Design an enzyme around this catalytic site. Sequence first.
Site, PDB file in Angstrom:
ATOM      1  NE  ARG A   1      -4.204   1.926   1.735  1.00 47.74           N
ATOM      2  CZ  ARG A   1      -4.822   2.911   2.376  1.00 47.74           C
ATOM      3  NH1 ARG A   1      -4.328   3.393   3.509  1.00 47.74           N
ATOM      4  NH2 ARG A   1      -5.937   3.422   1.873  1.00 47.74           N
TER       5      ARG A   1
ATOM      6  CG  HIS B   1      -1.778   5.352  -0.589  1.00 47.37           C
ATOM      7  ND1 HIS B   1      -2.455   5.802   0.524  1.00 47.37           N
ATOM      8  CD2 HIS B   1      -2.666   4.615  -1.297  1.00 47.37           C
ATOM      9  CE1 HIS B   1      -3.700   5.358   0.488  1.00 47.37           C
ATOM     10  NE2 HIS B   1      -3.854   4.634  -0.606  1.00 47.37           N
TER      11      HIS B   1
ATOM     12  CD1 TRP C   1     -11.586  -6.352   0.301  1.00 48.48           C
ATOM     13  CD2 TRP C   1      -9.685  -5.883   1.388  1.00 48.48           C
ATOM     14  NE1 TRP C   1     -11.457  -4.984   0.346  1.00 48.48           N
ATOM     15  CE2 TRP C   1     -10.300  -4.669   1.009  1.00 48.48           C
ATOM     16  CE3 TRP C   1      -8.472  -5.837   2.091  1.00 48.48           C
ATOM     17  CZ2 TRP C   1      -9.744  -3.421   1.305  1.00 48.48           C
ATOM     18  CZ3 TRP C   1      -7.916  -4.592   2.387  1.00 48.48           C
ATOM     19  CH2 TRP C   1      -8.555  -3.402   1.992  1.00 48.48           C
TER      20      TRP C   1
HETATM   21  C1  HEM Z   1     -10.605   2.718  -5.553  1.00 52.86           C
HETATM   22  C2  HEM Z   1      -9.242   2.563  -5.093  1.00 52.86           C
HETATM   23  C3  HEM Z   1      -8.858   2.173  -3.799  1.00 52.86           C
HETATM   24  C4  HEM Z   1      -9.444   2.521  -2.629  1.00 52.86           C
HETATM   25  C5  HEM Z   1     -10.658   3.427  -2.432  1.00 52.86           C
HETATM   26  C6  HEM Z   1      -8.692   1.887  -1.575  1.00 52.86           C
HETATM   27  C7  HEM Z   1      -8.999   1.965  -0.224  1.00 52.86           C
HETATM   28  C8  HEM Z   1      -8.324   1.298   0.792  1.00 52.86           C
HETATM   29  C9  HEM Z   1      -8.674   1.356   2.188  1.00 52.86           C
HETATM   30  C10 HEM Z   1      -9.829   2.142   2.793  1.00 52.86           C
HETATM   31  C11 HEM Z   1      -7.793   0.576   2.850  1.00 52.86           C
HETATM   32  C12 HEM Z   1      -7.690   0.369   4.350  1.00 52.86           C
HETATM   33  C13 HEM Z   1      -6.585   1.182   5.006  1.00 52.86           C
HETATM   34  C14 HEM Z   1      -6.493   0.929   6.499  1.00 52.86           C
HETATM   35  O1  HEM Z   1      -7.526   1.071   7.191  1.00 52.86           O
HETATM   36  O2  HEM Z   1      -5.390   0.592   6.978  1.00 52.86           O
HETATM   37  C15 HEM Z   1      -6.933  -0.028   1.863  1.00 52.86           C
HETATM   38  C16 HEM Z   1      -5.927  -0.949   2.147  1.00 52.86           C
HETATM   39  C17 HEM Z   1      -5.052  -1.502   1.224  1.00 52.86           C
HETATM   40  N1  HEM Z   1      -5.029  -1.186  -0.115  1.00 52.86           N
HETATM   41 FE1  HEM Z   1      -6.440  -0.173  -1.148  1.00 52.86          FE
HETATM   42  N2  HEM Z   1      -7.658   1.146  -2.106  1.00 52.86           N
HETATM   43  C18 HEM Z   1      -7.724   1.337  -3.472  1.00 52.86           C
HETATM   44  C19 HEM Z   1      -6.820   0.823  -4.397  1.00 52.86           C
HETATM   45  C20 HEM Z   1      -5.712   0.036  -4.107  1.00 52.86           C
HETATM   46  C21 HEM Z   1      -4.674  -0.319  -5.052  1.00 52.86           C
HETATM   47  C22 HEM Z   1      -4.642   0.116  -6.524  1.00 52.86           C
HETATM   48  C23 HEM Z   1      -3.729  -1.009  -4.365  1.00 52.86           C
HETATM   49  C24 HEM Z   1      -2.485  -1.482  -4.827  1.00 52.86           C
HETATM   50  C25 HEM Z   1      -2.192  -2.057  -6.124  1.00 52.86           C
HETATM   51  C26 HEM Z   1      -4.199  -1.121  -3.001  1.00 52.86           C
HETATM   52  C27 HEM Z   1      -3.555  -1.819  -1.981  1.00 52.86           C
HETATM   53  C28 HEM Z   1      -3.953  -1.866  -0.645  1.00 52.86           C
HETATM   54  C29 HEM Z   1      -3.382  -2.735   0.361  1.00 52.86           C
HETATM   55  C30 HEM Z   1      -2.264  -3.751   0.130  1.00 52.86           C
HETATM   56  C31 HEM Z   1      -4.061  -2.514   1.513  1.00 52.86           C
HETATM   57  C32 HEM Z   1      -3.828  -3.208   2.874  1.00 52.86           C
HETATM   58  C33 HEM Z   1      -2.980  -2.354   3.818  1.00 52.86           C
HETATM   59  C34 HEM Z   1      -2.727  -3.011   5.172  1.00 52.86           C
HETATM   60  O3  HEM Z   1      -3.194  -4.149   5.395  1.00 52.86           O
HETATM   61  O4  HEM Z   1      -2.053  -2.380   6.014  1.00 52.86           O
HETATM   62  N3  HEM Z   1      -5.359  -0.392  -2.846  1.00 52.86           N
HETATM   63  N4  HEM Z   1      -7.250   0.456   0.609  1.00 52.86           N
END
Ligand code: HEM
Length: 291
Positions: free
Chosen positions: A45, A49, A188
Amino acid sequence: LVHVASVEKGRSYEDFQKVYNAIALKLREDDEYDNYIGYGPVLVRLAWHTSGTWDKHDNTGGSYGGTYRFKKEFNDPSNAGLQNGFKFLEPIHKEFPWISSGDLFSLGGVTAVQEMQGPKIPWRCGRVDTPEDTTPDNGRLPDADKDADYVRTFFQRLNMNDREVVALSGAHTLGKTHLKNSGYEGPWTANNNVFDNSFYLNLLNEDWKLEKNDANNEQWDSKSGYLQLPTDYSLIQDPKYLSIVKEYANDQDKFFKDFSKAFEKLLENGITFPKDAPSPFIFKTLEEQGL
Ligand code: HEM
Ligand SMILES: [K+]
């Protein structure tokens, strides 16, 4: 502006494989993080970002400058929780001070995906740190309480099409949402530190209910204990996205190939690579090296 990749003085593949190895070894060592999920997901992530701030219209933002090291970006509400990934990389940067911040942030994501048994992701070096005044303002990362139209339009700014959007969203195969960070809670998938196509399988096969979490935000929940953000669920609400979701849910190899291409592209947006720049590097995993 134009950002020309500039190889860290005298460095080559072997140097970056050493950085990759240090990251991979630390990933293996600090296995307790986030109730034993490990730092894999947060590093992915962080890479996204730090790259996702890019704007194709004026080449602002992007992975090139490694601007996340500056407070404005570091404190972006959209980046809540990423400080954990940055802290993980601190000792890595101290051992290899010669690598740029942008190269480290992006390499961190590549290393995490591969070590978690995901596809190989070619990676190129050459990102150069830029001044604090080049840090992009907050608000360039996506909201999670939106629909398919928002998602489609949002990603056009990163020059990503439907297929690229669906593939990249598949990264949610990893980690989880943390109420305190984003206002959403839950993972997820069950094997959230193993990179696979379960995000698509769960989205299609689980029975979903639109509920409100403890932060008063709506999220789709399954009795199995999983969630899908409104933006994730929009991938099956939109007929064009749906076809691709079904494709990846039924072809693990195709998803791997497409994610690899889209992720490298994401990490390289905004960067101009000289015609004489080295070819992209494909690092060996610790397992492949017998380490
Ligand atoms: C519509 C686009 C996206 C939205 C709205 C979104 C939103 C989010 C949200 C709300 C979280 C939770 C953060 C937290 O509470 O720690 C998250 C986690 C994460 N996202 Fe997405 N995301 C998007 C696209 C992506 C993309 C393109 C990637 C990478 C290719 C990605 C990779 C991750 C990963 C790996 C996590 C897990 C982080 C952790 O477990 O600490 N996201 N995202
Ligand atoms: K998974």
